[PDB]
Amino acid sequence: MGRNRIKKVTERLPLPPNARRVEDPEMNMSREVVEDPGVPGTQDVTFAVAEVNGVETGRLPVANVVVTPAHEAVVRVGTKPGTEVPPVISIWDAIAGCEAGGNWAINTGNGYYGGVQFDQGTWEANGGLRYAPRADLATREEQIAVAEVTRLRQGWGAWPVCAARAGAR
């Protein structure tokens, strides 16, 4: 018995647009872009809410109804052939922490690029142009793909401080 800590509360919340995907054969498969944000809708969501001492201790949606439907968004998704990115096998995240503080897009004008501070020749020699003109223009996972090629072909010499710091082979 006693007062019930659980009450029903109905809230009007946004209904986010579904994204309809449109292929872009000029964009890397790693990439997705919002071409049209659509228009959010609205929905009435009923929650069971627990409160003790004027403080919410829990909530659970129990019902929902569309009020205004959203207008769909349009997302462009990359389908450029040959831009498949291998799965990442995090020694690299440690290295990028050391090299660039985890900033994969770093480009300070020091002659090095991206999270693991490739020079341009090393980026190109190890296949990086498949993904981007420079390392900093490529995704983390693309940069790691090229870093793995670099390591297999040339070793850890590109990272003469950070690789050892990261506990490399």
| Resolution of the solved structure (Å) | 1.8
Q: Which of 88, 103, 119 is the last residue of a domain?
A: 88
**Domain count within the chain:** 2
**Residues 4 and 60 occupy one common structural domain:** yes
Distance between CA 29 and CA 24 in Å, rounded?
Answer: 9
DSSP classification of residue 38: -
At 123, give phi and psi (nearest 5°): -55, -50
128: its two tokens: 């990086």
Q: Which of 59, 88, 117 is the last residue of a domain?
A: 88
List the one residue out of 83, 80, 71 whose CA is nearest residue 38.
71
Experimental technique, in short, is X-ray
Name the β-bridge partners of 45.
11, 64
CB 115 within 8 A of CB 143: yes
Specify the CATH number for the domain of residue 53: 2.20.230.10
Specify the CATH number for the domain of residue 153: 1.10.530.10
CB 69 within 8 A of CB 15: yes
**Residues 123 and 63 occupy one common structural domain:** no
At 146, give phi and psi (nearest 5°): -70, -35
Distance between CA 157 and CA 49 in Å, rounded?
Answer: 58
Helical H runs in 101-137? Answer: 120-125
Q: CB-based burial of residue 53 (10 Å sphere; 0-12 exposed, 13-18 middle, 19+ buried)? A: exposed
**Residues 140 and 82 occupy one common structural domain:** no
**Residues 97 and 46 occupy one common structural domain:** no
List the one residue out of 109, 89, 114, 88 whose CA is nearest residue 99.
114
Q: Which of 88, 106, 126 is the last residue of a domain?
A: 88
Positive or negative: CA dihedral 24, 105, 139, 18: negative
Distance between CA 20 and CA 102 in Å, rounded?
Answer: 32
**What length does the chain have?**
169
Separation in Å, CA 155 to CA 68, 128, 149, 164: 58, 16, 9, 12
Residue 22 belongs to domain spanning? 1-88
**Residues 140 and 63 occupy one common structural domain:** no
Residues followed by a gap in the chain, C→N > 2.5 Å: 89
DSSP classification of residue 147: H
